Structures are given as structure tokens and as C-alpha cells.
Ligand SMILES: OC[C@H]1O[C@@H](O)[C@H](O)[C@H](O)[C@@H]1O
Ligand SMILES: OC[C@H]1O[C@@H](O)[C@H](O)[C@H](O)[C@@H]1O
């Protein structure tokens with residue numbers, strides 16, 4: 001059954017951590033639903049963001065950090081492996097130098113560490129999705 | 140108590156119709172929650188949009204139409220009467236030539252009719268809000 005959205009979970013990340021999310025957009029891509037995943041430095045939603053991942057389904061992905069309350073330099077990708085109307089599996093792996101983002105088992109986005117992943121205390125998953133699965137694992 | 144979000148209601152609009160919404164953003168403005176209100180030509184969410192109203196709380200408002208599946212020329216306002224953390228009352232009045240948008244009883248946005256308001260069959264209210272009230276009335 002469905003997890004509450006927004007979904008907030010305490011987390012610790014290091015090299016070899018994976019965050020796995022299964023959900024589905026609430027509406028068709030023509031209506032531009034969003035998905036956002038934020039790796040926060042505190043449990044509080046207003047805390048700094050080590051890794052901001054925002055999908056505008058059918059359009060683009062932006063990634064950023066929010067440091068001392070201020071947004072930094074946006075990275076943009078037009079890569080769109082998400083399929084209109086379908087369930088997705090998103091997995092975000094912590095590599096030594098970067099986050100690796102897989103969608104449905106395909107390498108789709110990377111983002112170099114601006115802040116050590118050890119600074120993360122919380123993950124929030126929110127915007128226009130239903131969520132069936134959220135897991136933090138380690139290998 | 141809370142109405143389901145996304146919230147979809149069949150509606151007929153003409154000169155003197157008002158759409159009144161009461162809700163609150165799910166999260167602080169620093170996190171840029173959205174509100175969207177769409178006046179659709181059919182019950183189907185993929186149908187054309189006579190009036191698209193999208194708030195990025197703390198940042199801006201965009202208004203548009205979506206005609207034969209294609210988005211038209213965006214109108215942008217930096218007007219932001221919405222208050223961080225607070226309940227809002229949004230009312231959208233159908234005037235002869237335009238929609239008048241009031242926030243907490245203050246005139247905030249207008250948008251000239253591109254399509255007669257009689258073409259509207261459905262209103263959808265969605266994105267990062269909780270909704271306590273939705274009413275269509277006439278004077
Ligand atoms: O560049 C500033 C903007 O960066 C984007 O990546 C964020 O999603 C926010 O919209 C922010 O305001
Ligand atoms: O985000 C940058 C790049 O990351 C890689 O991991 C992906 O395989 C795509 O090639 C993408 O363009």
C-alpha cells in the first residue's frame with residue numbers, strides 16, 4: 001500500500017549507500033507532474049540540501065544544492081527515461097566522487113559531491129507522485 | 140476536514156461565476172511548493188485548459204492556456220500576497236473580458252479570456268497544498 005507524500009525518513013549515507021524509491025506520477029506527462037528527492041543536513045525541511053533532484057516529467061531534470069539557505073548553480077538534463085503513466089524504480093547510489101541515479105535499471109544522471117554525503121541526516125520524497133517503496137541499503 | 144488532492148470537480152462558468160478555494164501549502168516557501176488551478180474543457184485531465192494558474196510559492200505566478208494539446212504564450216507575475224506557513228483564500232471571478240484572481244481579499248492577478256468561459260467543464264486543484272474548501276457560486 002501507499003506511503004504518505006511528502007515522505008520524510010532519517011538516513012545516513014556513505015560510499016556504497018543506495019536509496020531506492022518506487023512510485024508513479026499522479027497524472028499524465030502532458031500536465032507536467034513533478035518528483036523531488038532532497039538529501040537534507042537535518043530532520044527539519046528548511047535545512048540545507050546536499051543533493052536536490054527534481055523531475056518535471058516529460059520535460060527535464062534539475063539538480064542543485066542549498067547551502068546556508070542559498071541555492072547554488074543548477075545542473076540541467078533533458079534525459080527522460082521515465083515513461084508516461086507507468087510505475088518507476090529510481091535508485092540513487094553514493095559513489096566516491098558523485099551520486100549515480102538509475103531509472104528502471106538504466107544509468108540516467110550523475111552529480112559530483114559538493115558536500116560529503118556523511119553530512120546527510122534525512123531524505124524527503126515529495127510532489128506529484130504516489131510512493132509504494134522507500135529503502136536505504138548498503139553494499 | 141481535508142478534500143482529496145488532486146481535487147477534480149465538474150463546473151459551468153459564465154460572467155458572475157466565482158471559484159473559491161481555501162488551503163495551505165504543505166511545506167515552507169524556501170522549499171518552493173506549487174499550487175495549480177486548471178479550468179478544463181472536459182472531465183479528462185489531458186483535456187485543453189482555458190485558464191492555467193500556477194503559484195511557485197515565494198517566487199512567481201505563471202498563467203497560460205493549453206489549446207489542441209499545445210501550450211500558448213505564458214503570462215508571468217512576481218506578485219506574491221501568499222504568506223509563508225499560512226492558510227490562503229483564493230477566489231477566481233469570471234468578469235466579461237477576464238478572470239480576476241483575489242488572494243485573502245486582495246486583487247492580485249488578471250488574465251483576459253482567450254476562450255469563452257462557457258467552454259469550461261471541470262476545475263482541477265493540485266500540487267503541494269492541503270485543501271479545506273472548494274466552491275463554485277454565482278452573483
Ligand atoms: O537557481 C535557483 C533554483 O535552482 C533550482 O535547481 C531549484 O529547484 C530552485 O528552483 C532554485 O530556486
Ligand atoms: O548526468 C550525466 C550522465 O550521467 C551518466 O551516468 C548517465 O549514464 C548519462 O550519460 C548522463 O548524461
Ligand SMILES: OC[C@H]1O[C@@H](O)[C@H](O)[C@H](O)[C@@H]1O
Nearest residue numbers: 032193201202203210211213
Ligand atoms: O511555455 C510553455 C509552458 O508554459 C507554462 O505556463 C506551463 O506551466 C507549462 O510549464 C508549459 O510547458
Ligand SMILES: OC[C@H]1O[C@@H](O)[C@H](O)[C@H](O)[C@@H]1O
Nearest residue numbers: 216218239246247248249250
Ligand atoms: O495581473 C495584472 C494585475 O491585475 C490586477 O487585478 C491586480 O490588482 C494587480 O494590479 C495585477 O498586477
